[PDB]
Envelopment polyprotein
Amino acid sequence: KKDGCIWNADLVGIELRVDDAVCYSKITSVEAVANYSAIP
Amino acid sequence: CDEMVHADSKLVSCRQGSGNMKECVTTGRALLPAVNPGQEACLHFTAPGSPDSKCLKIKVKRINLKCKKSSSYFVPDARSRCTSVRRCRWAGDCQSGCPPHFTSNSFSDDWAGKMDRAGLGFSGCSDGCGGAACGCFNAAPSCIFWRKWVENPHGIIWKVSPCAAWVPSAVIELTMPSGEVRTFHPMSGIPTQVFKGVSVTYLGSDMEVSGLTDLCEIEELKSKKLALAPCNQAGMGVVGKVGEIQCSSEESARTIKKDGCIWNADLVGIELRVDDAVCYSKITSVEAVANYSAIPDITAIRGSFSVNYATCTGEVTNVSGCYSCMTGAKVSIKLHSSKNSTAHVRCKGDETAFSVLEGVHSYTVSLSFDHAVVDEQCQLNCGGHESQVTLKGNLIFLDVPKFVDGSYMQTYHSTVPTGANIPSPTDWLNALF
């Protein structure tokens, strides 16, 4: 809800059909995407 | 299920809406290890009250390598048609200097402005024939107006997406404690979050990864077959790529009428003559232009659940054979219970927990386990504790008992054991000194 935080252009996966559109996404979780250590 | 992890019910907030059966609402986070393919994993729910509890079964089916549709675009089959209305000067009265501005949508010259069966084709004048040969008797030359259509009589449409990556993913079926079964495909190599009902599943272990070049998928709407290509894609049609017309409505993918889809500058082959213009094209079909092939720790996060809420006997019947095989041996138990309920672990089984569910009759539900020797003791299954015991000789991967041929070779191997040392001892005295 706060304006300070900032989106990504065309990040969210909207795709169309003959009737109505469905949702997908291409975002990545913080874990296991680029992780080089884990604190003991 | 062989691997099983119980919840962390320390989050306790249950409203006693009904006294006979309780109610509760809870959430949290869980960390269950990845099960082998072809088997289902469990998740046990606990309540401070004893009699009632539920379960949740997560079934895996396949391991494969797909990638997520970051975009989506349609491609019609372009064709180039072109018309020509040929006024001559003082009869079309068209300007001596051709108007450098051109109205690319209306064309008031031929019937005002209407729907154009082309997607933003261009406009222009031309050189001028004038004299007795063209016959309208004026000396000065005549401008000619031309159209170009990008058209599609009977299209075959392809939808394409440039993931340009490959990460492992699997097939998951889910079992809500209520009894719902909803399917979906989680991209569990990437921390994607698929939404359904109350729960969400996410990442696993990428125990193997591989690399591959810039390729992505081509699929046909009539479903001829499935095709693969270098499959370049962006917001615009770059030179020499597979996809030139990139158009974003299937219901408008037959004709060319939606604005979303985007042309190429000077793509269509209009050429002039002394009378009228003719059509050509330089577009390339998807096939045989750049084609490089032709196709022949799973964990979940919990939302605000909708958790819901006597005498019972076990009465086993038989035992099967497996120890140290990746599936385990299957055991059958014939129970009856006056209520619909779920069971729980045998403490002395010493291999895995339990999560059975029964109807109010005498049935049997069979589960998989492995052991060196059968013990089968100490289960707090259902309602009350019962201590039933089984006995059977389990089967393991061993040698062949059928013929006992290895017995004969075992007797032959132990041959002249003392003889060699006896000859060695006498030679040892000579060799040492």
In short: Chain B touches chain A through 17 residues (CB under 8 Å). The longest strand of chain B covers residues 58-66.
